[PDB]
Amino acid sequence: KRYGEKLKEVFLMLDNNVVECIKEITESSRNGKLVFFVGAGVSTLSDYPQWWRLVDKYHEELYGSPKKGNYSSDEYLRIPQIFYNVKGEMAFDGILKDFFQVDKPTNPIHDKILAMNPAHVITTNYDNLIDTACWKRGKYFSVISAEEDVANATSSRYLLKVHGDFRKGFKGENVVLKEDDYLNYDQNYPLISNLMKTIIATHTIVFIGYGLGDYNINMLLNWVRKLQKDSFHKPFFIRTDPSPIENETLIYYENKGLRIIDAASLIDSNEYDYLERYSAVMDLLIESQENKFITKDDEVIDYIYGKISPLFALQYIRKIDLKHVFEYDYHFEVNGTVVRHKNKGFGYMERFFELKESCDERSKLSKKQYERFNALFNFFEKNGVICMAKDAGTLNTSIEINSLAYHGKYDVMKKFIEEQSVSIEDDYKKAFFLACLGRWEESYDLYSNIILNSIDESNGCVYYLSQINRYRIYQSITQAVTQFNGLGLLTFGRHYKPFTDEFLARIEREMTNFNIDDLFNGMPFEFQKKYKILEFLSDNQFLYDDTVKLFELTNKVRSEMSEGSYSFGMSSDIVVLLRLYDNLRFLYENCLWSVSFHEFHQYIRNSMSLLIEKAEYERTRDIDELGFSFFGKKSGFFMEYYDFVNISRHFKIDDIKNLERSCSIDKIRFGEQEKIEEYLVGIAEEITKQFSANGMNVVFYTQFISEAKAALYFAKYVKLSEEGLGKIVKALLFYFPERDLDIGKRYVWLERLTKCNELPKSIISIIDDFLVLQAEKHIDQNYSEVSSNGLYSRDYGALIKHFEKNFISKRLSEITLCLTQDKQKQIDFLFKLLPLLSTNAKSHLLSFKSVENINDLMNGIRIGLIDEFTPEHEELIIEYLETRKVNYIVEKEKGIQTFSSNDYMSTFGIWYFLEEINNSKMEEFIGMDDQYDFFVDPENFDYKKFIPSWLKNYNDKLLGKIAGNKHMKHHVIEVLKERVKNSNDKRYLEILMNYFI
Template identity: 25%
Template sequence: MHLHSVYIKNIKQANENDRLAIFVGAGVSKSSDSDYRSLPLWSDLMSELKSDLAITEDLDYLKLAQLYYLEFGEQTYNQVLRKYFPEDITPSSLHRTILEVNPRVILTTNWDCIIENAIEQEGYLYDKICTDKDLVSSASPNKIIKIHGDFKNHNVVFKEDDYLNYSRNFPLIENYIKSIFSTHTVLFLGYSYNDINLKHIMKWMQSHSNSAPPMYLVNFKSDKPQESYLSNHGITTLVLDGENYSIDDVKNLDKRSALTQSFLTSIIKDDGEVDVNDEQDVIGFIYERIKHLKKLNSITHNQIRGAITNCGFRYDSDGLNVLELFKPKGVLTTDCSDSTRSIHEKFLEILARIDSFGEDEKDSFYRRNSKLTEILSILALAHIKGVVLPEANDNGRIVYFLNEKIDSAKNLEESDRKYISFSESECKSNDYIKYLSSGSYESYKLGEYEVAFKKNSELILACKRHKIYSILLIALFNKNSILWRLKYSFSNKNRSDFEKEVEVKLQDEFFKFPRSEIKRNQALYDFLALHSVHQKANDCTKKILDLTRAVESIKAGGISFNNYADEPTCTHINLLMFSLKNHIMIDQYAPYKAVMRDFVNISILRQSVKKIVKLNQYEIYSAIQFYPSKELQSELRVFFKSEDSNQLRLSASGGCLEWVVFTVLPKLTGQLVGSLSLFDGYESKFENCVRLLAVLNLSDAQVSNVMREFSRLIASDSTAVGTYEAINEFLAHQYELFDRDIETDILINILNTVIDKIISKTAHGWDQHAILNGSIGNLYGYIGVVKGEYTDKVRARRLVFELESYKSEEQRKFSKSLLYSIFKISDESVRNIIKAFIKVVISQSKTKGIDDWEFELWSFAVGFKDFDAEAISRLDEYLVQFRDGKIFSSQLYSLKNLTQYLINEKEVDALEGLNEELGDLIDQYEQRPNLSSI
């Protein structure tokens, strides 16, 4: 590598680390010369001073200025200086280029205001320092320091006394400048070898450490003695010439200024001094752009796109994608750079050549070019299976260089399942950072938020200590996620302990990073700040609308084309695994959850024109993890039993069904059974899993395992109405969609589990609510459908024995629900036991409230009691209270249904009058005006 390339690399690295200072001398100001206005030379000023003093001999200009000041006084002295440095000089492109480099510190010995004018015009943020007071009050890390003062502050440093008294007049600025030499790489621009200012600066440098960062002086003519002299003071001379730096594109500048601008441009440009004919340089260029990403366990497409630039992706139906590096005059992008694209073109030529190698030749090339192997490994972290090559096949399909560092899509799915199986992973790792990251994440998932907070705090300190900025940014984000749980979760009893913990202002922390790390981690920050998540949400909304229109068009006989049909699937996998593998605690943020749901919705919509919709494991995971239970139920309605001949079916890709039935469902059941809180979300995930399974065509073995998990859950004390309803739906859909023949023993076993909870007094309120309100009604129905028969007399006796201890009101409720449901599927001996109990309940005295009337009519309807004509007059008297419309009970609907049933099925015509009146009361209620109160 050319020495200049090494020096540029050092300067560029210093700038990325916020450790570059540029000294601007008089030569830079001369770049503002124009055809109608030329800045005077120092020699012009010296000549006027000598002429006014009538001095002919050569004097040091410091002494000359001192003599002029003593002879003519301060006012005349200042006037003559101002004449040579007008304030209205227009900055040149060189000044603007210096600002584009954006060094942390700009120092200048110039008195003119050209650089300040450029800062103001271009909108850069620099604090101007002309006095010690300015330095004390400066808040910005970016500073422009006028070390020789300026006319506005009346502190110009020029005459001999000014230099002799500098330490007394500018003590803070002098010490600050000296500190710059110890901490910053310094670049001198616009200084000649014999510049008196440079010599004065070198005096300050004499005491700085030998281990200080390098210093460079830009010049245009080689002078070995002078260069050796400067080298002894730690300054490396960079001689610029037309061979190394092209000035063809630089307009309106003299040659020296043009060469300086070209040199600065090479610092700004990301491609630096890359020799496109050098394989190592080209490969190294790509590697340098993405090497920072290898610290992460997974990478987003946006991170790759932002790091490499001038690139895009092709998406495949297997969920993987192919990187496309844009060539010159190719796809127009906002980051378009011809020089970068030229390097891309050479890189693609290298890949094309490797692609033609045999295996041994490939292995040899990879051993010689380890950076290429690293590039492929990093791309694999973003599920990139190859790089598009320039040639195209005859059939128009893309040809790509295969990334041998990535597994097949099938193997990737299998390896990814440990992240999406709702199970805990071991936090064993020799890497302390990874150990803390995974440990904090697992504690968070388990609801152990205080442990998670402690480990995450240790992770933040460790990342700061080792300067691992990407993981630090994630840990800072995770701190807020954990704090939210600690402060506001009802499951946390120690909320008050964390009330004073301050949440992280992620943007503020991010902008404290070194400039190079801000650039490298911009895509990660955009994701964590939810900027890119919101953008993806907008994209998904548009995609859903477009798909909806396309589906309607296709169903109406039209056609629709989409070259990016597989993009949502690839992006979904990428974003989901990025979050999970990097332990990002983003699952509680609504925009992220909405995007994950949208991807599932898009997949269903896109395939809805077919007869079968096939979901992959990532979509199944997202459906379980991110949907509210009722919303998923609504989403799945398209798969419910339909009389339409085009019945839409749901399927799962690959071995997903086995995975869901034998891994995911047992994990969710176990988590729900072991849950200590109503607010941990396990119930919703279990319900979602069951609702998905309900509309999937399962094998007998899979159904048996599902039913075993149901039995395990019902036997626990973690059941809720939603879980019973999900189980009920599973039975209904499995029968309606697939005419499923579930083994009687399995169904009876679940029923016995329910009965045993009543017998053992372990049935809690949700259990009883589900039993009494028909939330498991399909269980009895299924037993009847498969011609099952309940024959357990011992259990039946124990059940009625337990119910005998209940209050009359509860006995009536259980008689109508559980007992009668068992009665209908039992043999004669069990029926007799149940019937005897219910008859006793019927014979009990009643208060004749609405519950009593409902039970009595039910008794008539099921044939456990003969119809009593006197009941009509008693019921008529009871309904008096509702006739004025002031009060109403929803149970009147039930009474209406019972009277209608008795009329239609039992031919009790005497109830027609009451049935009609019940209908009138219900109509009167439903037609009442809507009232509101404040």
């Protein structure tokens, strides 16, 4: 139990030199430069037969008795040699097989060796203990024991069993045991020798299981003498002899050029306690393998400086990723608390934070240390890092700050783009701005330019970011060209090619067969070591963490909603918001092009959707008395400017419709109306500039129309200024494309802004200008209103009439007085706007035309020229109903259907139900449509055709009349209360509460 404690006691007392050896071994293992030389000493711990045993056995066979004396090194080689030549190689084979053919268990040292993840492992052992220890760990070292093996090695990692082994067979020919074998090592093992020599030259060497005066050790020292001075890393020796290495021995074997570690000095042990010494060394190494070398509480600033100093390059990084800096030694929660995760040495950061709290203790720092502490403290504030979690007080959550690219600024980005680029960082931001402005070809080419310039300047960070940005913009251009050639030629009519075909071919040829999965893999070793924080960006599966965290936090918040639990502390919504803002800042401020991609769209969309949903629920939630005791008048969810930007950008129309429908977002108070008004007027100015001018970018158009579409759509909630409202309406009515926002979408968004704030007389003038333009546009007979929603310019005139009780559109009146019979189409449309045009002009239009058919009767009765339904008008309705009846009986053989005729039929049925039309032929037409019978004769009508639209798409006076009729009331209330019970809906609830009961 206290073996680790005793070894950490050994640590902090080891000689500085030994500590440095251990450190270098560590960093070599992390860098994958460790090469473990495994001698027979490690095999001795595993009980594997010792060589002296076979040497004594050969002595016995040869001379009939053991030597009873110390075998010199030459004797250890001669005795096997004489035996080999005397008894023949058969007896050598036999003794080799009898002694060495014995299974062993991989001792603790065998496992600890493969726990270092060595680059390669060299051994002068013939056992397969190292092979089995290699296999069990899961890794795969390619064994090497013959010239044939060197050529055949599938994996980069090699198990270099120098001096062969017996895997081919238990024969001396494949092992170095006798004087003949040692003498002609280079003769028989040339390629192995060369591979061994390169592996020694390149990778760090660790002699373990060895004797300081071994043969191969001396051969390698002759080889390192051959090496150029200071062009060799001193190999590492692990002495495990029970006796303590003498000072003279240390001096001599260091002079040879060896970094030797002596187990006897490190730990005390018995004389046969070899395993304890080997384990002491190896567990020392394993123990201090991850940020364990903390010097003291005076080196705190120094340690953290070395850990953080390379990190000054990045302007800002997510605090979740600050764990990687210290190797998970401290978990920085999203709020900023330093949650201790793993630490051995005292004063890892707690001393540094104490220095922050205690000015005098900071004053004890050296001036160099004081400046380092200051810089670190400034950096941690820049990252948001809050004080140690142990001393964490109340923590304010402030919105993360971003740059202008995130903002809705567009003229400033052009200003920068025209400005001179001082550094490749400025040019990098420029290319980001070009991409944001839709100029994706210039953005891509400029990104290639920064690629070259940066890697010339060796900005590893900016080069990494520019590489991924170049890939991202390449993907942007490629996909966009795909969508262009596929549909964009349909969207306008003739395919746009801002990206010239030769430019596309050059880009496609420029890069191909490349994936960003290995982008981080190809970077220098210092970059990968110091900046693992940016590996998160490496893979093509970006957001490799944040999406599932959002998912599980949704699950938790949803469960909180359904069960209604009175949470405390940083709730799941708060961690969701902190992740959202940290990710938005880290992306936009860092200038990666990924900000616009669909993954981020989904992530931000789902973040803000959940936040608003919880904002709604917490309002409606009932409070138990114990709940009120826990808290009352609890904090809500303020919608600051940043929230409006995020929602406006990363949502589309339908999802905002769903959010507004489910959540009564209008109740949620907004704030920062000045900045959001600036954003909205900026978007209006941008679309006004893009459409006022014939010149524009389709590439920018597709990207930003959705942004502008959502932003203007969400604009309803915040208040605009009079200038802001005027600019908004003018950008909408006269400078918004008909391609995407048709006339009906134009009207309904105008109506949203109308509901938001009252329309001054200037806006009345704008709507009148729109109306007059449409009146003149109908000079062409071919012209006709086209709008999917079915909302026309007469709607706009209706808004003017609603706002202004008295207002004459003199331009429309003048147009009327100018019309002729040939201009019957303009006549029809101006008739549609009769309430706006003047009195003499009204007489003009009345003289021009009047009702003639069902369509024109509808036209006339709509604005209400006809104050009483004439006998002729009801008779004409009867005639068109005869037409419908003959078409129905004709269609009875066919498949009957009604889309627009059913509108007129329902209108007449309602008028009959309202008693407006006394024409009894309506009753004769009973049965063609369910609604007709339901209205004209509800009693006879079968109360089973009640459509949900009828049950929700209602009318207030029609609702009152329905409630008046008991016969219809019983069935309608039954079905309506049933429907609300099956699915809780606000509209059905209001049908129920307000009028029926």
